[PDB]
Amino acid sequence: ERPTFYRQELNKTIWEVPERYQNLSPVGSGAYGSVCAAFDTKTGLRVAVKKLSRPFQSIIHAKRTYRELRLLKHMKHENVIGLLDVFTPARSLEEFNDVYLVTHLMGADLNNIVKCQKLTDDHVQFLIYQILRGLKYIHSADIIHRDLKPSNLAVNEDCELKILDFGLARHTDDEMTGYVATRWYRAPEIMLNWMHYNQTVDIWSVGCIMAELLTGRTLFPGTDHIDQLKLILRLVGTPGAELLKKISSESARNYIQSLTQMPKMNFANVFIGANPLAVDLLEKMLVLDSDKRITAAQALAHAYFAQYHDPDDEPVADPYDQSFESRDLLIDEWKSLTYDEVISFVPPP
Numbered sequence: 001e002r003p004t005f006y007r008q009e010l011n012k013t014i015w016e017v018p019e020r021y022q023n024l025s026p027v028g029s030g031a032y033g034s035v036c037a038a039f040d041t042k043t044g045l046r047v048a049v050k051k052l053s054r055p056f057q058s059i060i061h062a063k064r065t066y067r068e069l070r071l072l073k074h075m076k077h078e079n080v081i082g083l084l085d086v087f088t089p090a091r092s093l094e095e096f097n098d099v100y101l102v103t104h105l106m107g108a109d110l111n112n113i114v115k116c117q118k119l120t121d122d123h124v125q126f127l128i129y130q131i132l133r134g135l136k137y138i139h140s141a142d143i144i145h146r147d148l149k150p151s152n153l154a155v156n157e158d159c160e161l162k163i164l165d166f167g168l169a170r171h172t173d174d175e176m177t178g179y180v181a182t183r184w185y186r187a188p189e190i191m192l193n194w195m196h197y198n199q200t201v202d203i204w205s206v207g208c209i210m211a212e213l214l215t216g217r218t219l220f221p222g223t224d225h226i227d228q229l230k231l232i233l234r235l236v237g238t239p240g241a242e243l244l245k246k247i248s249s250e251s252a253r254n255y256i257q258s259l260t261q262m263p264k265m266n267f268a269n270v271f272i273g274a275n276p277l278a279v280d281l282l283e284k285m286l287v288l289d290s291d292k293r294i295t296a297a298q299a300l301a302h303a304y305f306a307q308y309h310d311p312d313d314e315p316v317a318d319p320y321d322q323s324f325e326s327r328d329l330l331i332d333e334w335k336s337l338t339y340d341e342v343i344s345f346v347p348p349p
């Protein structure tokens with residue numbers, strides 16, 4: 001009872017997918033893999049199907065395919081994308097060469113819904129509640145998103161949200177360059193490599209996202225890493241002695257110490273007219289010192305989310321074994337591990 005596969009030409013590439021998936025149509029390539037929307041006739045869901053992609057052409061590609069599949073199989077939370085299905089047209093490990101991952105398709109991304117557009121306060125509470133609820137879960141598994149931004153927040157018509165692309169974060173020097181949304185939401189310590197960083201890199205990005213939902217404008221649209229740092233330091237202040245010490249990169253501590261000291265601005269004068277509770281929570285997320293930033297779990301308990309908070313309905317993850325991250329294997333070994341993961345996949349209920 002291996003399903004029946006059929007073949008389509010799409011992206012100018014062959015898709016070979018089980019007959020359960022019908023009406024495939026492109027919703028974009030990437031480098032990465034191609035994504036298609038599809039109707040899953042078995043679940044009644046609209047789904048996103050990602051074909052990787054030369055998955056085992058280098059060690060870097062093989063480890064990455066294994067990582068993504070492992071991450072997706074782990075995640076079981078309403079506000080985190082998980083795996084609905086994984087499949088290969090291949091019948092043996094020897095023939096194994098393509099992986100397709102299937103995922104709920106919420107509908108759009110947040111970026112395409114909200115940008116240039118200011119949201120109502122109740123709409124903001126809901127979206128950020130769900131981002132922190134799914135981040136509490138991800139972080140509890142010891143996973144860092146590292147690249148949270150509106151384009152990887154999948155949102156449906158009812159403003160319900162799942163987080164995409166956690167744990168992968170492997171951008172080139174060039175995708176991060178100049179006046180680009182790829183960098184606007186990243187934590188200063190990660191943008192400028194100040195230190196080996198914690199999970200609160202992600203709470204900095206929620207803060208950037210939240211401020212943009214409230215105001216309709218990017219919070220730190222820097223034209224480059226240094227311009228963006230200056231936008232940052234102008235709002236939150238230059239570091240103190242105490243943070244300067246923790247900046248293990250000697251090079252970066254020397255640069256930042258060159259800067260004219262500036263105090264933290266008043267967030268109620270930047271976020272004029274906003275819910276005081278929204279402003280308070282922004283001041284707790286946008287703290288420069290990552291050791292002092294609010295965590296997803298503490299933030300969910302904040303008064304801003306009184307309507308939505310239910311401490312009994314904010315679950316945590318079973319633990320995630322990333323011991324494989326510090327293992328060097330050969331192509332065929334990553335590939336065989338990936339295959340074991342493809343074949344033991346048990347669909348959700």
Ligand SMILES: Cc1ccc(C(=O)NC2CC2)cc1-c1ccn2c(C(C)(C)C)nnc2c1
Nearest residue numbers: 048049050071101103108109154164165166
């Ligand atoms: C198919 C797929 C596979 C894995 C991951 C993924 O997140 N992998 C990393 C966590 C390990 C994301 C998607 C995916 C891709 C685009 N999507 C959209 C658009 C088309 C609206 C952007 N909405 N939902 C999605 C979901």
